Paper text:
Microbes are protected from the cytoplasmic accumulation of environmental fluoride ion (F-) by export of the toxic anion via fluoride channels known as Flucs. These small, homodimeric ion channels are remarkable proteins in two regards: first, their unusual ‘dual-topology’ architecture, in which the two subunits of the homodimer are arranged antiparallel with respect to each other, yielding a double-barreled pair of pores related by twofold symmetry; second, the Flucs stand out among anion channels for their extreme substrate selectivity. In contrast to most characterized families of anion channels, which tend to be non-selective among anions and sometimes poorly discriminate against cations, the Flucs are arguably the most selective ion channels known, with >10,000-fold selectivity against the biologically abundant chloride. The protein possesses two deep, aqueous vestibules with an electropositive character due to an absolutely conserved arginine sidechain and a deeply buried sodium ion at the center of the protein.
For all four mutants, we measured fluoride channel activity using either single-channel electrophysiology or bulk liposome efflux experiments, and we solved x-ray crystal structures of the mutants together with Br-. The S81C and S81T phenotypes were more extreme: for both mutants, fluoride efflux from liposomes was completely abolished. From the structural data, it is not readily apparent why S81T does not transport fluoride. A bromide density is observed in a similar position, coordinated by the threonine’s hydroxyl, and with similar intensity as wild-type, and the surrounding residues are not perturbed by this mutation.
Author numbering:
A (entry chain C), B (entry chain D): 1 to 96
C (entry chain B): 1 to 125
D (entry chain A): 2 to 126
Write the structure that this text describes.
Amino acid sequence: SVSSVPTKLEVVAATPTSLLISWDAPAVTVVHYVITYGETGGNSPVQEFTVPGSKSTATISGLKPGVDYTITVYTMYYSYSDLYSYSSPISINYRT
Amino acid sequence: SVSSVPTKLEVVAATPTSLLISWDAPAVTVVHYVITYGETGGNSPVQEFTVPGSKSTATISGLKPGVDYTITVYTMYYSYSDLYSYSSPISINYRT
Amino acid sequence: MIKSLFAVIIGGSVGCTLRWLLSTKFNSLFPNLPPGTLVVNLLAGLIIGTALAYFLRQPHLDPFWKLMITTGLCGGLSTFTTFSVEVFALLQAGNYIWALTSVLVHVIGSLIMTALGFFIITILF
Amino acid sequence: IKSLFAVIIGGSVGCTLRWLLSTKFNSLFPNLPPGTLVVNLLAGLIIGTALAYFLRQPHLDPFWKLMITTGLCGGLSTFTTFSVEVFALLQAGNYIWALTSVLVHVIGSLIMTALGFFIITILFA
Ligand SMILES: CCCCCCCCCCO[C@@H]1O[C@H](CO)[C@@H](O[C@H]2O[C@H](CO)[C@@H](O)[C@H](O)[C@H]2O)[C@H](O)[C@H]1O
Ligand SMILES: CCCCCCCCCCO[C@@H]1O[C@H](CO)[C@@H](O[C@H]2O[C@H](CO)[C@@H](O)[C@H](O)[C@H]2O)[C@H](O)[C@H]1O
Ligand SMILES: CCCCCCCCCCO[C@@H]1O[C@H](CO)[C@@H](O[C@H]2O[C@H](CO)[C@@H](O)[C@H](O)[C@H]2O)[C@H](O)[C@H]1O
Ligand SMILES: [Br-]
Ligand SMILES: [Br-]
Ligand SMILES: [F-]
Ligand code: NA
């Protein structure tokens, strides 16, 4: 009953085509984080990559200017009861 | 199943008031050896002393010339089944 | 061997169960060194240390109890694998400082808890 | 209560398997009893494979996970027996094999967890 979900997910720096996001780590042993991003508008493909568990920021690049993106973060964490499992996502919206 | 008693206990050098004894370690983690000695004629205080598990020889000193001594060696040994426990002795008689 | 087997299982079940209850309640409170899995190794390390000295002084104890206490309780209470994955997960999280710390504390801590339970009973007797 | 049964059923199997393996084999090489090593290497393998594998099947009954890990791996593996052997070696003055036994058990079980993990990991790739 300790949350594996990160908190306080926010954009801290933006260019027209890139974002710098940061989150607060959940109080568990995160192996890596999964970051996903797609255009909030409809059926654009959502893309993802990993960031190592020590890191708690991630740059997203290659975006289109003045487009609304949905950014989502969740964890691959070790817990005693679950071994390696995935947290639920935390999600923000941001417009380049 | 494996014997924890030393073998080939023997006096390897003698003076009239001392014995150098040695024995073959058994096939177990011997924590330490105990050496007992007293006069074979049921009328001397048996004395015991320890020597470390790595040694296989010991010096018995302060003996009387021309007397029959009973000398034994047994192990305090570790084994899986019994944890720490004492072995049966190997015994010899020796006249100085 | 059937009576032996019952000692293993009873002692083990009491051990495994204790480790489970302690782990789920306490591990998540300090993930860098989960304290539930530490205490069950420090605890069973203590128990086996007392058993070391007491069994020695009681050559005639029924083995059924010795097997139930050591292979059973202590074998089921302690863990090498939970200690292992936590260190493995720390390593994969790149948290090496705590992976290494976790190894030292478990190893040197168990031995201490063993020497403790041993030299307590020694000195008592 | 259904979780209790998985730990017991799994732990009992792990404990029972630890008992049979160690009695038959520990005495063959007392400087590093190989029964106790093997159970720890083997449970490490199991927990490594269970690590990678369970990650990929997040719908599996937690019952089966708990039986294999906290149960079987928890019962099969042992810390106190590894510790007791070391302690015995340490009291016997056999430092070199006390040290070796620690390296081999810890380094060895981590390498076995990594294989079990990366085998499954590489399998799915
Ligand atoms: C004694 C032996 C010690 C060494 C053990 C092996 C260490 C080096 C592994 C090399 O292969 C790795 O495979 C990972 C996948 O298995 C990749 O991780 C990628 O994918 C992972 C998920 O599969 C994420 O957790 C990672 O953060 C992400 O970089 C990672 O890039 C790659 O280098
Ligand atoms: C002495 C006893 C040894 C016994 C065997 C130990 C086995 C250890 C397994 C480690 O697993 C790897 O750890 C890397 C490092 O933690 C991870 O890299 C991930 O994390 C790194 C560190 O943050 C990044 O630099 C990498 O690019 C990223 O892939 C990598 O994915 C992961 O597979
Ligand atoms: C990594 C640390 C882990 C935590 C601590 C674990 C402690 C384990 C060893 C303690 O037991 C002592 O070990 C000494 C060394 O084996 C023995 O010395 C005995 O053997 C020595 C062998 O050289 C002799 O010099 C001594 O006089 C003799 O008493 C001593 O009797 C024994 O009680
Ligand atoms: Br486990
Ligand atoms: Br044990
Ligand atoms: F322990
Ligand atoms: Na165990």
